[PDB]
DNA sequence: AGGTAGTCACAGCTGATTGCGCTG
């Protein structure tokens, strides 16, 4: 796995060999008006029998509560244990491991307290972008070709977007501190 | 027999007529199993039938047995009926009469179960709840004493005939009082609500001899079951047969009524408990009863030896001889254990086993002593020259169902005396045809 | 012997208090001893 | 020998069961024990049964009494427990032992059982 | 001997129901009260031994609410209607407090269950559950009391079921998850009675047999001591375990211990 | 036809005999 990870990051020009082992080692009085109105409305209140439920409402509720309904959804990842074959699942696991390691390096670099780390974080972001372009885009193309219904790439996209937003916010703070 | 067993044996017309009264529907619904009640409540507001598969998918796979039992019981009680859904499907929908009356009982609608109580104003001779309970106890004790035959308790002739029809007491010779049978002892050993229910079921079965409507009697009984204790109800609005049934209930102690012409009647705790602790048991085979009436003392003495009789306490010892005598009288050990557990003192209820296991096990073992030897009269055949001849005769005996015991190793068989002639004729004919 | 084991087990295991208790079972933890709970 | 047997009965995991013949029917220095299995005690000695029970108490523990059905030992056991039931003890009746046929026990077949009659009748102390 | 106790907590916040009436929607407080009464009547119908309690949660305080129809049901419904009328008609807005006192209602429900359990005879076990219908928004100021109530309910093995109408409540989700209850959000308000009868009517033993909706995504966001707001990441003390949104050189709670 | 002193089993104790061990 480590050798496979090394090839996918160094041979594919995602990261340099030097950097690879370096890391390894409410409203106005209208509310009172509404309260008065509801108090007056409920002052003359009587129990009801027909209006409590209707045949249409009960049928709709049973349809919702029947299997395959909104609340009782029956699909819910039917055969993901066998969907998207394990050959792709192994590749997805490898991508998850690579993303986890790169983000671990990024979050270990954070917070940036010295000017040396500033270049290191930029290099880490460049490595993340190169890894994304190298692996995720062909992975997304393969998924679209196979038309997989699962949004496997979505979590990786969310993690990358969170890291990029954090870095952009930190850069914006750094620029404002120098103003 | 419980209520559901009797209801399931009635014709569909009687069941349909019963559901026309809201009180009957509530009793039937409460008699249902736990799973059936949820299905009834879910389908209470449905105007369309549901697929059978959809209903079957509500319960998990492991509990499918309970689902099948509940569905079968509902079908037998005719609460819902099969509907031919278009497209070859089968739909289940509640009975419209039963559903309407159940909703009326729950939500509301129509007129009250009783006519009124304020028309005649307050009762001039109203009693209290403890007084009503004492009256019910006195009536039930009088009935059970009349079962024994003491001259102090004198009841109506028809009440005695009802016991005669129930088989508890048989009048072999006219003029002399009937003698209680073993079934009478077993009935006495039963608890009071079960005794009342058995008596009412016998009354329902034999009502056809008196020409009384079963549906009306059942509806009135169910209405009495849900009646509020200590509250009077209107006699008016009932048929003449219902008046006679109410008088019989008053004789039974279920209903209190000052006069036959009175327009008020007070349901008692027996009537409320009709639809549905003073004995201390010790590990040293001793019984302590906090009772004073002769009835409980006699019932406990039926299967135990009395030692002391305090004004408010009875000290008794359960011995082997007393239990054996009670079993010889016809009372089984299970009935004794049930009676002890039902009458158990509230203190004994604290232990997870209400009755200590040693006493119950000892009583059960004492019951098994009597039936150690099993007796079956019969005729023994041991003159079989060949195994093949024995096999044919044994097969013929098993076909006739007159076999008692078989021994293939020693070619020995035992047959009932009634089938002995048939077996002899079959054996003789085989030799003649040879 | 093969049959001797079966005959002895049948005689011993079900002599007096089994020809009736088993019939009742067919027709129908705190106080249980440790060997009866295993 | 008795002293050394009783001494090695307690502080030894290899051996943890001993047999006593009317010797422990008094107050001795027997170590703490949990299980007592009495077979063929005296006739109706409530004192002996109470003493034997006292060697166990010190469900932490449990003591068994083995009797033979349809024999005088039944009446002896019945009449020798009336002291303990007065003390408050309840004697549960055990008719079947769970897993009796699960494992192998002695006298499995009828041959050795009927051979045991020869040796048990061989006393002939006349 | 199976005694089931069903304490129903009704969110009777006047402001939310007033806004609902202003919206002129098909669902009002009257229909909700009718559905609650019908559910209680069904619960009493299921068995003789079943016991019912209805508690109305209001801004001022918590109010114990409890002709062809059943006699006991008639009296129960009349008492419920009288109590809800007395609560709503005499409910005068005096103060800026708007959040519903849900925690106090649950505490009163737990106290009532504790009282009922002792009065239950020793031969019977009283299984108790609490059903809550949520109308107004969740209250963050009551986080600690709500958590204490959840823990007390879990200690006594009391189910807490939430029936959210409009806005989800994280506290109710946590209560349902911890106590083993069911959390359900009603999509169509007029179907409230049918939802209650289909889902919350069966007991926990009956819930085992029946197939029920899976638990919803329960959140576990904590409440900051100095802000009382939902937070994702916060500073937690090591001595008193108090949670803070920002770092402080001296813990405020540890000041108590000298 | 009924009841109390021998008697057997199993244990205890104390009172003598009587039989094996007793130095780097
Ligand atoms: Zn803070
Ligand atoms: Zn602190």
From Swiss-Prot, chain A:
Q: Which domain of life is it from?
A: Eukaryota
Reproduce the UniProt comment on modification after translation.
(Microbial infection) Upon Rift valley fever virus infection, interacts with NSs leading to ubiquitination by the NSs-FBXO3 E3 ligase and proteasome-dependent degradation.
Localization per record: Nucleus
Q: Which family does it belong to?
A: Belongs to the TFB1 family.
Function (record text) = Component of the general transcription and DNA repair factor IIH (TFIIH) core complex, which is involved in general and transcription-coupled nucleotide excision repair (NER) of damaged DNA and, when complexed to CAK, in RNA transcription by RNA polymerase II. In NER, TFIIH acts by opening DNA around the lesion to allow the excision of the damaged oligonucleotide and its replacement by a new DNA fragment. In transcription, TFIIH has an essential role in transcription initiation.
**Quaternary state and interactors:** Component of the 7-subunit TFIIH core complex composed of XPB/ERCC3, XPD/ERCC2, GTF2H1, GTF2H2, GTF2H3, GTF2H4 and GTF2H5, which is active in NER. The core complex associates with the 3-subunit CDK-activating kinase (CAK) module composed of CCNH/cyclin H, CDK7 and MNAT1 to form the 10-subunit holoenzyme (holo-TFIIH) active in transcription. Interacts with PUF60. (Microbial infection) Interacts with Rift valley fever virus NSs (via OmegaXaV motif); the interaction leads to TFIIH complex proteasomal degradation.
Q: Which organism is it from?
A: Homo sapiens
Whichever gene encodes this chain, its name is: GTF2H1
Query: From the entire protein, which fragment is shown?
Result: 123 to 548 of 548
Curated annotation (Swiss-Prot), chain B:
GO MF, one term, reads: ATPase activator activity
What's in the keyword line of the UniProt record? DNA damage, DNA repair, Nucleus, Transcription, Transcription regulation
Name the domain of life this protein comes from: Eukaryota
Name its GO BP terms in alphabetical order. Answer: DNA repair; nucleotide-excision repair; transcription by RNA polymerase II
Kindly list the places in or outside the cell where this protein is found, as annotated in its UniProt entry.
Answer: Nucleus
Keyword DNA damage in annotation? yes
Q: Which NCBIfam families match?
A: tfb2
Query: What job does this protein perform?
Result: Component of the general transcription and DNA repair factor IIH (TFIIH) core complex, which is involved in general and transcription-coupled nucleotide excision repair (NER) of damaged DNA and, when complexed to CAK, in RNA transcription by RNA polymerase II. In NER, TFIIH acts by opening DNA around the lesion to allow the excision of the damaged oligonucleotide and its replacement by a new DNA fragment. In transcription, TFIIH has an essential role in transcription initiation. Stimulates the ATPase activity of TFIIH subunit XPB/ERCC3.
What UniProt notes about the protein's domains is: The C-terminus (residues 305-462) stimulates the ATPase activity of XPB/ERCC3.
Q: Which family is it part of?
A: Belongs to the TFB2 family.
Designated name of the protein: General transcription factor IIH subunit 4
Swiss-Prot record, chain D:
Which part of the chain is the Helicase C-terminal domain? 1-106
Domain of life, per UniProt, equals Eukaryota
Q: Quick one: effect of changing residue 51 to A?
A: Very low 3'-5' helicase activity, wild-type ATPase activity, wild-type damaged DNA removal, 80% decreased transcription (all in vitro)
Using the record's annotations, give every residue carrying the modification Phosphoserine.
90
Binding residues annotated for ATP, in chain numbering:
55, 58
Q: Where in the cell is it found?
A: Nucleus
Q: How is it modified after translation?
A: Dephosphorylation reactivates the 5'-excision step. Phosphorylation has no effect on transcription or the 3'-5' helicase activity.
Another remark in the UniProt entry says:
The TFIIH core complex from patient XP11BE (a patient with XP/CS who has a C-terminal splice-site frameshift from residue 741 in this protein) reconstitutes in vitro transcription about 30% less well than wild-type but does not restore NER in vitro or in vivo. The XP11BE TFIIH complex has all the subunits in the same stoichiometry as wild-type. Purified mutant protein has very weak 3'-5' helicase and ATPase activities. In another paper the mutant protein has wild-type 3'-5' helicase activity. The mutation is recessive to wild-type.
Q: Which family does it belong to?
A: Belongs to the helicase family. RAD25/XPB subfamily.
Which protein are we looking at?
A: General transcription and DNA repair factor IIH helicase/translocase subunit XPB
The top of its lineage is:
Eukaryota, Metazoa, Chordata, Craniata, Vertebrata
What gene is this protein a product of?
ERCC3
Swiss-Prot record, chain E:
Task: Name any Gene Ontology BP term.
Answer: nucleotide-excision repair
Note the InterPro entries from the entry. Answer: TFIIH_Tfb4/GTF2H3, vWFA_dom_sf
ZnF (C4-type) spans are 237-254
Naming one, the record's GO cellular component terms include: transcription factor TFIID complex
Q: Where in the cell does this protein reside? A: Nucleus
Where is the signal peptide, in residue numbers?
none
Q: Which UniProt keywords apply?
A: DNA damage, DNA repair, Metal-binding, Nucleus, Transcription, Transcription regulation, Zinc, Zinc-finger
| GO molecular function annotations of the record | RNA polymerase II general transcription initiation factor activity; zinc ion binding
Q: Does the record bear Manganese in its keywords? A: no
Main subcellular location = nucleus
What functional role does this protein have? Answer: Component of the general transcription and DNA repair factor IIH (TFIIH) core complex, which is involved in general and transcription-coupled nucleotide excision repair (NER) of damaged DNA and, when complexed to CAK, in RNA transcription by RNA polymerase II. In NER, TFIIH acts by opening DNA around the lesion to allow the excision of the damaged oligonucleotide and its replacement by a new DNA fragment. In transcription, TFIIH has an essential role in transcription initiation.
Subunit structure of this entry? Part of a TFIID-containing RNA polymerase II pre-initiation complex that is composed of TBP and at least GTF2A1, GTF2A2, GTF2E1, GTF2E2, GTF2F1, GTF2H2, GTF2H3, GTF2H4, GTF2H5, GTF2B, TCEA1, ERCC2, ERCC3, TAF1, TAF2, TAF3, TAF4, TAF5, TAF6, TAF7, TAF8, TAF9, TAF10, TAF11, TAF12 and TAF13. Component of the 7-subunit TFIIH core complex composed of XPB/ERCC3, XPD/ERCC2, GTF2H1, GTF2H2, GTF2H3, GTF2H4 and GTF2H5, which is active in NER.
Please name the NCBIfam families in this protein's record.
tfb4
């Amino acid at each position: 796995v480590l050798f496979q990870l090394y090839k996918d990051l160094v041979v594919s020009q995602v990261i340099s060999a030097e950097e690879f082992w370096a890391n390894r080692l409410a409203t106005s009085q209208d509310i009172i008006n509404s309260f008065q109105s509801i108090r007056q409305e409920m002052e003359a209140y009587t129990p009801k029998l027909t209006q409590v439920l209707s045949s249409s409402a009960a049928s709709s509720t049973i349809t919702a509560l029947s299997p395959g309904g909104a609340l009782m959804q029956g699909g819910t990842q039917q055969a993901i244990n066998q969907m998207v074959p394990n050959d792709i699942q192994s590749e997805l696991k490898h991508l998850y491991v690579a993303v986890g390691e790169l983000l671990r390096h990024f979050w270990s670099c954070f917070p940036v307290n010295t000017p040396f780390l500033e270049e290191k974080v930029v290099k880490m972001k460049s490595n993340l972008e190169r890894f994304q372009v190298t692996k995720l885009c062909p992975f997304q193309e393969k998924i679209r070709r196979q038309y997989l219904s699962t949004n496997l790439v979505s979590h990786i996209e969310e993690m990358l977007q969170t890291a990029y937003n954090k870095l952009h916010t930190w850069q914006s703070r750094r620029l404002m501190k120098k103003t | 027999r419980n209520l559901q067993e009797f209801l399931g044996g009635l014709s569909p017309g009687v069941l349909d007529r019963l559901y026309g009264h809201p009180a009957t529907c509530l009793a039937v619904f409460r008699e249902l199993p736990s799973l059936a009640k949820n299905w009834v409540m879910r389908m209470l507001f449905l105007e369309q039938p549901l697929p059978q598969a959809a209903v079957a998918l509500w319960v998990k796979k492991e509990f499918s047995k309970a689902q099948e039992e509940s569905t079968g019981l509902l079908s037998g009680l005719r609460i819902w009926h099969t509907q031919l859904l278009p497209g070859g499907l089968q739909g289940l929908i509640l009975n419209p009469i039963f559903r309407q009356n159940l909703r009326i009982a729950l939500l509301g609608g129509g007129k009250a179960w009783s006519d009124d109580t304020s028309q005649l104003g307050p009762d001039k001779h109203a009693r209290d709840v403890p007084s009503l309970d004492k009256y019910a106890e006195e009536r039930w004790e009088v009935v059970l004493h009349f079962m024994v035959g003491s001259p102090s308790a004198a009841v109506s002739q028809d009440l005695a005939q009802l016991l005669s029809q129930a088989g508890l007491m048989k009048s072999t010779e006219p003029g002399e009082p009937p003698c209680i049978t073993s079934a009478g002892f077993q009935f006495l050993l039963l608890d009071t609500p079960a005794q009342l229910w058995y008596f009412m079921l016998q009354y329902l079965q034999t009502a056809q001899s008196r020409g009384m409507d079963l549906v009306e009697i059942l509806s009135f009984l169910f209405q009495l079951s849900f009646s509020t204790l200590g509250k009077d109800y209107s006699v008016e609005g009932m048929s003449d047969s219902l008046l006679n049934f109410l008088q019989h209930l008053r004789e039974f102690g279920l209903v209190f009524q000052r006069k036959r012409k009175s327009r008020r009647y007070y349901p008692t705790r027996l009537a409320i408990n009709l639809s549905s602790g003073f004995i201390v048991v010790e590990t040293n085979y001793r019984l302590y009863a906090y009772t004073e009436s002769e009835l409980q003392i006699a019932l406990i003495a039926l299967f135990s030896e009395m030692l002391y009789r305090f004004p408010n306490m009875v000290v008794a010892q359960v011995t082997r001889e007393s239990v054996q005598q009670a079993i010889a009288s016809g009372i089984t050990a299970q009935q004794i254990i049930h009676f002890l557990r039902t009458r158990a003192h509230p203190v004994m209820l604290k232990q997870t086993p209400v009755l200590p296991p040693t006493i119950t096990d000892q009583i059960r073992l004492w019951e098994l002593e009597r039936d150690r030897l099993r007796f079956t009269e019969g005729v023994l055949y041991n003159q079989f020259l060949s195994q093949v001849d024995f096999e044919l005769l044994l097969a013929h005996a098993r076909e006739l169902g007159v076999l008692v015991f078989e021994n293939s190793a020693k070619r020995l068989m035992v047959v009932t005396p009634a089938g002995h002639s048939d077996v002899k004729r079959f054996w003789k004919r085989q030799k003649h045809s040879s | 012997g093969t049959s001797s084991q079966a005959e002895a087990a049948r005689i011993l295991a079900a002599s007096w208090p089994q020809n009736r208790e088993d019939e009742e079972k067919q027709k129908l933890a705190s106080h249980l001893f440790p060997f009866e709970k295993l | 020998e008795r002293m050394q047997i009783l001494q090695n009965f307690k502080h030894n995991p290899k051996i943890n069961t001993i047999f006593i013949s009317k010797v422990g029917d008094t107050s001795f220095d027997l170590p703490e024990a949990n299980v007592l299995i009495q077979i063929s005690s005296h006739g109706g000695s409530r004192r002996q049964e109470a003493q034997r029970l006292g060697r166990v108490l010190r469900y932490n523990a449990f003591f068994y009494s083995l009797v033979s059905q349809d024999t005088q030992e039944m009446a002896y056991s019945t009449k020798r427990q009336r002291f303990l039931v007065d003390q408050g003890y309840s004697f549960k009746v055990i008719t079947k032992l769970a897993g009796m046929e699960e494992e192998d026990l002695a006298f499995s077949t009828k041959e050795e059982q009927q051979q045991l009659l020869q040796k048990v009748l061989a006393a002939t102390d006349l | 001997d199976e005694l089931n106790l069903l304490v129903i907590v009704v969110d009777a916040n006047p402001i939310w129901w007033g806004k609902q009436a202003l919206k002129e929607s098909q669902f009002t407080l009257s229909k909700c009260i009718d559905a609650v009464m019908v559910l209680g009547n069904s619960h009493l119908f299921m068995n003789r031994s079943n016991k019912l309690a209805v508690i109305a949660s209001h801004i001022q305080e918590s109010r114990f609410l409890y002709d062809g129809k059943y006699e006991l049901l008639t009296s129960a419904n009349e008492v419920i209607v009288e109590e809800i009328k007395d609560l709503m008609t005499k409910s005068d807005i005096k103060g800026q407090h708007t959040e519903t006192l849900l925690a106090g209602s649950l505490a009163k429900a737990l106290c009532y269950i504790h009282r009922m359990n002792k009065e239950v005879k020793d031969n019977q076990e009283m299984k108790s559950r609490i059903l809550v219908i949520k109308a107004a928004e969740d209250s963050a100021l009551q986080y600690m009391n709500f958590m204490n109530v959840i823990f007390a309910a879990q200690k006594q093995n009391i189910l807490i079921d939430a029936c959210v109408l409009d806005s989800d409540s994280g506290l109710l989700q946590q209560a349902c998850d911890i106590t083993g209850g069911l959390y359900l959000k009603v999509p169509q308000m007029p179907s409230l009675l049918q939802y209650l009868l289909w889902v919350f009517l069966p007991d926990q033993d009956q819930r085992s047999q029946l197939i029920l909706p899976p638990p919803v995504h329960v959140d576990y966001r904590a409440a900051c001591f100095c802000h009382r707001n939902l937070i994702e990441i916060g500073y937690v003390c090591s001595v008193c375990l108090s949670i803070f949104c920002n770092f402080s050189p001296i813990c405020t709670t540890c000041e108590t211990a000298f």
